Amino acid sequence: ALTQPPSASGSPGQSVTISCTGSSNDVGDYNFVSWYQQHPGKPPKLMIYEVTKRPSGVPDRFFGSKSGNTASLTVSGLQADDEADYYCSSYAGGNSVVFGGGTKLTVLGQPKAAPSVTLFPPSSEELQANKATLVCLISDFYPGAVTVAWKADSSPVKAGVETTTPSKQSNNKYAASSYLSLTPEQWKSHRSYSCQVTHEGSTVEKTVAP
Amino acid sequence: EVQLVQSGAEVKKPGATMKISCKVSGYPFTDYYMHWVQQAPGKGLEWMGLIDPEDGETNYAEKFQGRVTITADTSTDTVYMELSSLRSEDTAVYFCAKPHCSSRTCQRVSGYYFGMDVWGQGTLVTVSSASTKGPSVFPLAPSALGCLVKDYFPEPVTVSWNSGALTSGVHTFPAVLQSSGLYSLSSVVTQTYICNVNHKPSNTKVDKKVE
């Protein structure tokens, strides 16, 4: 009900501004706009209340404002741990609390890193069960977005493909998985299969064969 | 000093009903309302509604109207939220949140205006038509080593290597959710390598040595 940009980004020590666009019934006619910071797997943490006030313990770097129907949050002197999801919320006429969609803020400390790809063939055990699974393991990439494309010989295959989301690793890089389900007959009929991982324009490939 | 303790994770069939708890400490229980917020996986915060524990009056968001019930028990300082007629779209984390008091006297603190300053850890809820099933474990070997943990439900699975003696160079990947309702993950290592795959929900433990 409150509109935020899906993502924003800023370099350490620089600044970023997060917009929150609503209605006159909420952000427009009331000074009851909140901001929440949410780190992964953690409950939100109130950062701003009443458009510009800050709860005890919130540094002055988080600066709230609004203009008409659009409220904004600016964060200054960006540090790594400002990286999080930021949500706005407001009172809305008729006794309701309304939220924004949230904005994933990234802070640009880590260098861009290409994924390491490992492609595994199906096990002889699994073939005995008349099933075959190709496992493509993708690690150590930053930023955390890849697309995955599979190929039988030179021909692309999208049937039977299942790909996870990116997940942050312990070293702050990202990981992901893709599985290609095949019949034993399909596995044996082709010269080879390949898993192609595209990351920020550059593709890394691995291949396996019966 | 204010702690909000939510009940444990839930796994639920469609059409079922859940009832989760939020135990409260650190402040006078009946002086603050209590809010419930839903958060679908990788999606936004969505308000469910509130209860005033002083009079037991509630207010539910229109999106959950008819399916949700919030109740409070002043004897145990606990707020409950019940969600009826569940479907997989209700797979989400569910938070309770205590209104933030910006006023000079913190009485009948509704939370409509000044946000919520203390939240419970969240209660994860999975709604799936699938049922409990233990994994099959297959070697992963080239032509880098590991095990494929195939077709289990529900989360989680623990994977160690050589009874935990092997910690260096081990990478266990988050599972993929197949369209079949089952999960499959891989764990890899980059003189003998043995999987220790634990799936407590199905009471399955598999030890798998890989060449």
Side-chain angles (χ1 to χ4, degrees), chain A residues 1-55 57-97 99-190 192-210, chain B residues 2 4-61 64-88 90-103 105-166 169-199 201-204 206-208 210-211:
Chain A
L2 298 189
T3 285
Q4 307 185 219
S7 43
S9 181
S11 293
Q14 310 195 333
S15 267
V16 72
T17 310
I18 306 197
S19 82
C20 170
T21 296
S23 80
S24 38
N25 191 268
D26 42 72
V27 173
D29 301 348
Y30 302 93
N31 294 329
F32 297 139
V33 165
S34 303
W35 286 95
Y36 294 96
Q37 175 193 65
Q38 194 182 35
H39 282 96
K42 267 73 200 160
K45 183 186 169 59
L46 184 64
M47 308 274 89
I48 301 279
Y49 72 102
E50 290 217 64
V51 185
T52 84
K53 302 183 194 182
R54 291 186 297 278
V58 175
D60 56 279
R61 331 190 283 105
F62 302 95
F63 173 82
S65 94
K66 77 170 210 194
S67 150
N69 271 5
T70 288
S72 313
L73 167 78
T74 305
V75 192
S76 295
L78 281 149
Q79 335 167 335
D81 229 5
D82 297 343
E83 208 159 338
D85 290 288
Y86 287 83
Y87 298 95
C88 68
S89 99
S90 161
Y91 177 75
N95 276 70
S96 78
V97 172
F99 279 99
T103 315
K104 186 192 153 67
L105 177 66
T106 323
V107 174
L108 287 105
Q110 201 166 10
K112 153 188 177 173
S116 320
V117 190
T118 308
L119 184 56
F120 284 103
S123 77
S124 161
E125 279 209 44
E126 197 190 352
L127 296 179
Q128 182 65 52
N130 200 60
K131 300 200 195 120
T133 308
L134 305 180
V135 186
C136 191
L137 295 201
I138 320 169
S139 35
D140 279 1
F141 58 98
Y142 187 91
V146 299
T147 77
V148 180
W150 296 81
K151 303 231 203 297
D153 290 345
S154 308
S155 291
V157 48
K158 291 179 83 133
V161 160
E162 213 76 73
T163 299
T164 70
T165 57
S167 97
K168 194 143 76 77
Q169 302 177 154
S170 314
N171 62 0
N172 286 358
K173 302 180 178 84
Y174 286 77
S177 274
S178 172
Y179 296 73
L180 171 58
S181 282
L182 296 164
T183 74
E185 294 79 9
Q186 284 179 311
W187 169 236
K188 278 123 176 190
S189 79
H190 288 95
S192 68
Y193 279 84
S194 296
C195 166
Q196 284 176 350
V197 175
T198 294
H199 182 244
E200 299 287 306
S202 307
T203 291
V204 178
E205 193 183 53
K206 284 287 182 297
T207 304
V208 286
Chain B
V2 173
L4 265 51
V5 177
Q6 298 192 235
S7 44
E10 302 277 328
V11 169
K12 290 276 181 187
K13 289 282 194 312
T17 296
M18 55 167 334
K19 177 189 223 191
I20 52 184
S21 73
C22 181
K23 296 150 293 304
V24 152
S25 58
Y27 67 90
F29 177 68
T30 49
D31 280 339
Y32 294 72
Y33 292 23
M34 183 56 74
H35 291 243
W36 288 88
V37 176
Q38 187 198 45
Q39 180 161 46
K43 266 87 77 210
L45 295 174
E46 206 206 355
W47 191 60
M48 307 186 82
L50 59 81
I51 185 173
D52 178 2
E54 226 274 349
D55 61 357
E57 290 299 282
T58 51
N59 188 30
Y60 308 133
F64 300 91
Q65 189 93 246
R67 317 171 52 217
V68 67
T69 305
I70 307 172
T71 57
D73 187 359
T74 79
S75 76
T76 78
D77 290 0
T78 306
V79 177
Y80 300 101
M81 193 273 296
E82 186 177 48
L83 193 56
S84 94
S85 164
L86 295 164
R87 311 196 214 305
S88 320
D90 297 314
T91 301
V93 181
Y94 290 85
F95 299 96
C96 55
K98 171 201 82 73
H100 158 237
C101 175
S102 90
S103 86
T105 88
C106 295
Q107 313 250 303
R108 300 319 208 80
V109 189
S110 75
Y112 284 117
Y113 308 136
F114 313 122
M116 272 84 75
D117 67 329
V118 186
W119 298 59
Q121 74 279 19
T123 299
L124 296 99
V125 187
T126 299
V127 188
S128 170
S129 54
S131 321
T132 292
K133 180 195 176 302
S136 292
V137 189
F138 303 100
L140 299 170
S143 282
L145 171 156
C147 298
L148 168 66
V149 180
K150 188 173 161 209
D151 279 335
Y152 69 88
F153 182 88
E155 299 269 38
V157 153
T158 323
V159 173
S160 79
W161 279 95
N162 297 338
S163 314
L166 183 46
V170 153
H171 193 348
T172 306
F173 287 75
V176 67
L177 185 40
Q178 302 275 17
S179 53
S180 75
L182 309 190
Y183 297 90
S184 302
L185 66 72
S186 313
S187 163
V188 303
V189 199
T190 36
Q191 201 174 337
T192 69
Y193 312 84
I194 297 94
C195 262
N196 316 122
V197 182
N198 193 2
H199 189 226
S202 67
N203 278 289
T204 305
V206 183
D207 285 326
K208 187 74 173 199
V210 187
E211 259 88 35

